[PDB]
Amino acid sequence: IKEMPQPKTFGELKNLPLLNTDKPVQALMKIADELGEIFKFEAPGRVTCYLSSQRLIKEACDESRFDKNLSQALKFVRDFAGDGLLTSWTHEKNWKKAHNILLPSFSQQAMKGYHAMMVDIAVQLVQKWERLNADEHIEVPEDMTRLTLDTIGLCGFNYRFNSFYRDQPHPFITSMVRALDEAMNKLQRADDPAYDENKRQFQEDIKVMNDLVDKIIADRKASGEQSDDLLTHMLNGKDPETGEPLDDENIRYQIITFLIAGHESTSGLLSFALYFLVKNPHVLQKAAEEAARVLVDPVPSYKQVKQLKYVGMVLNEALRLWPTAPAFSLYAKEDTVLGGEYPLEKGDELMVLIPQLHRDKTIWGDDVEEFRPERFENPSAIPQHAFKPFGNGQRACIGQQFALHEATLVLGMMLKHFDFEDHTNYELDIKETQLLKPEGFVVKAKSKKIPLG
Numbered sequence: 218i219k220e221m222p223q224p225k226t227f228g229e230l231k232n233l234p235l236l237n238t239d240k241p242v243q244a245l246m247k248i249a250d251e252l253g254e255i256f257k258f259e260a261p262g263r264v265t266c267y268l269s270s271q272r273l274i275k276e277a278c279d280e281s282r283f284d285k286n287l288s289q290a291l292k293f294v295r296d297f298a299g300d301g302l303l304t305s306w307t308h309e310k311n312w313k314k315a316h317n318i319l320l321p322s323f324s325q326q327a328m329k330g331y332h333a334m335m336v337d338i339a340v341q342l343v344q345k346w347e348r349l350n351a352d353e354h355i356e357v358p359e360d361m362t363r364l365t366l367d368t369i370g371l372c373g374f375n376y377r378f379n380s381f382y383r384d385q386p387h388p389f390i391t392s393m394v395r396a397l398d399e400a401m402n403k404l405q406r407a408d409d410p411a412y413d414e415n416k417r418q419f420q421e422d423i424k425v426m427n428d429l430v431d432k433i434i435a436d437r438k439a440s441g442e443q444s445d446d447l448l449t450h451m452l453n454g455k456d457p458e459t460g461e462p463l464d465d466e467n468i469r470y471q472i473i474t475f476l477i478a479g480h481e482s483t484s485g486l487l488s489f490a491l492y493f494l495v496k497n498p499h500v501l502q503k504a505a506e507e508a509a510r511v512l513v514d515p516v517p518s519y520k521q522v523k524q525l526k527y528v529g530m531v532l533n534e535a536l537r538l539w540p541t542a543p544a545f546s547l548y549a550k551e552d553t554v555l556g557g558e559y560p561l562e563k564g565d566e567l568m569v570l571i572p573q574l575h576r577d578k579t580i581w582g583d584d585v586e587e588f589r590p591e592r593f594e595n596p597s598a599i600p601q602h603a604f605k606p607f608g609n610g611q612r613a614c615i616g617q618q619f620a621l622h623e624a625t626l627v628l629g630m631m632l633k634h635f636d637f638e639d640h641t642n643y644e645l646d647i648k649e650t651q652l653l654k655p656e657g658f659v660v661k662a663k664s665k666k667i668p669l670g
C-alpha cells in the first residue's frame with residue numbers, strides 16, 4: 218500500500234554522504250524525527266530501511282520472518298572477530314555450536330562464579346577514587362573503560378590487563394581500537410591506492426590480535442589450570458547437539474569477540490548512568506539511599522547486587538535513552554509485508570534504530586526525553602518489543618546478565634562510597650565508534666569515608 222520516505226540524496230552516491238559524519242547514529246535519529254517510523258536508505262550497491270516505531274519493530278522481531286543480518290559495520294568487524302558469536306550468521310555451524318556451549322557460562326546463575334572477580338576490579342575503582350587529592354577530578358568514561366576491560370580480561374580468560382596501573386594501552390588494545398576504527402572508516406569511503414597504508418596497518422593489527430590471543434590459548438592448554446573463567450568452559454565444553462567442542466581458532470574468535478562486545482558497551486552504560494544521575498539529583502538520592510540500605514557489608518555479595526532494584530531501573534533508563542550498541546540489522550527470510558503497508562522481498566535488509574524505538578511516544582508517553590527510572594517499576598505494562606537494548610531473540614546479547622551484574626555492582630559501590638558533583642556543568646557530547654559513549658564527561662567525588670573490605 219505505501220511508498221517509504223527517503224532522506225535527501227547526492228546523485229550517484231544516493232544517501233551515502235549522510236553517514237560521512239563523526240556522529241552517524243545521531244544523524245540517523247534526526248532523519249527518523251523528520252521522516253517518521255520507517256525510511257529507505259540507499260548507497261551505491263545497497264539498500265536498507267531504518268525502523269523507529271514499536272509497531273513495525275515488533276514485526277521485525279518475528280524470528281519466523283526475519284533473521285539477523287550482518288550490517289555493513291559487522292561485515293567489516295568480521296574481518297577480525299571471524300565466526301565468533303557476534304559476527305557469525307545464524308546458519309553457520311559455529312554459531313549454534315558456540316551459542317549452546319557458552320549459554321550456561323552466561324546465565325544469571327553463572328554470575329555467582331564471576332562475582333568475586335568483578336568485586337576485585339570494582340574495589341580497584343573505588344580505591345582509585347578514594348585516593349584522589351582534593352583538587353582532582355574523575356574522567357568518567359576513561360575510568361569506566363579501565364574497569365570494564367579489566368573485568369572481561371579476568372572473567373573471560375584469567376588475564377589481568379591492570380588498567381588502573383597505566384595510562385598507555387595494552388598492545389592488544391592498540392590494535393583492537395585501530396582495527397575497529399578502520400572498520401568504522403570503511404563505511405564511508407568510495408580500493409584506491411590512497412588506502413594501501415590503511416590496508417597494511419589493518420593486516421598488521423589483525424595479526425597482533427590473533428598472535429596475542431592464540432598464545433593465551435596455547436599457554437592455557439600447556440599449563441592445564443582450571444579457573445572460573447570463560448576460557449575454561451570453552452576448552453572443556455561440548456555442544457550437546459553435535460557433541461563437538463569448539464576448536465582453537467573459534468575459541469580465539471570468541472575471546473576477541475568478548476573484548477569487542479563486552480567492554481566498551483558496558484563502560485558506555487556506566488558512563489551514561491552516572492551522567493543521568495548527576496543531572497537528576499533526586500534520582501541520584503534515591504539510588505544512593507538504596508545502595509546504603511542494601512550494601513551493609515564491607516564488599517557486596519552476589520545476593521545484595523540482586524537486591525539493588527532501583528539501581529537496576531536506573532541502568533535500564535540509561536539504556537532506554539542511550540543504548541550503547543544503538544542498532545542491529547535483519548533480513549527478510551521470505552517475501553513478506555511489513556505493517557500491512559511495506560512489501561519486502563526475500564533478502565531485503567532492515568535496521569532497528571534502538572534509540573529512536575525507545576523514544577516512541579505511543580509507548581512511553583510524552584515525557585520520553587525525561588530520565589525517570591520509575592518507568593520501569595511495572596515492566597509487565599511494557600508492550601512486546603518496545604525496549605530492545607540487547608537486541609532480539611536467539612541473536613540477543615549473550616552477555617546481558619554479565620553486563621547488568623557488573624554495572625549494578627559497580628554503580629552500587631560508587632553510590633555507597635561517594636557523593637558526586639557535576640563541577641563543570643558538563644554538556645552531553647556523545648562520541649560514536651561502533652558504540653556510544655559520553656566524551657569528556659568529568660565529575661568530582663567526595664568520599665563518604667566508608668571502609669572497604
Ligand code: HEM
Nearest residue numbers: 302303478479482483486542545607608612614615616620
Ligand atoms: C550494556 C552492555 C551491552 C549491551 C547494550 C549489549 C548489546 C547487544 C546487542 C544490541 C546485541 C545484538 C547485536 C546484533 O543483533 O547485531 C548484542 C549481541 C552480543 N553481545 Fe552484547 N551488549 C552488552 C554487553 C555485552 C557483554 C558484557 C558481552 C560479553 C561478555 C556481550 C557479548 C555479546 C555477544 C557475544 C553478542 C552476539 C550474541 C549472539 O549473536 O549469539 N555483550 N549485544
Ligand SMILES: NCCc1c[nH]c2ccc(O)cc12
Nearest residue numbers: 291294477478479482542651
Ligand atoms: N555486545 C554489544 C557490542 C555490539 C553489538 N553490536 C555490535 C556491532 C559491532 C561492534 O563492534 C560491537 C557491537
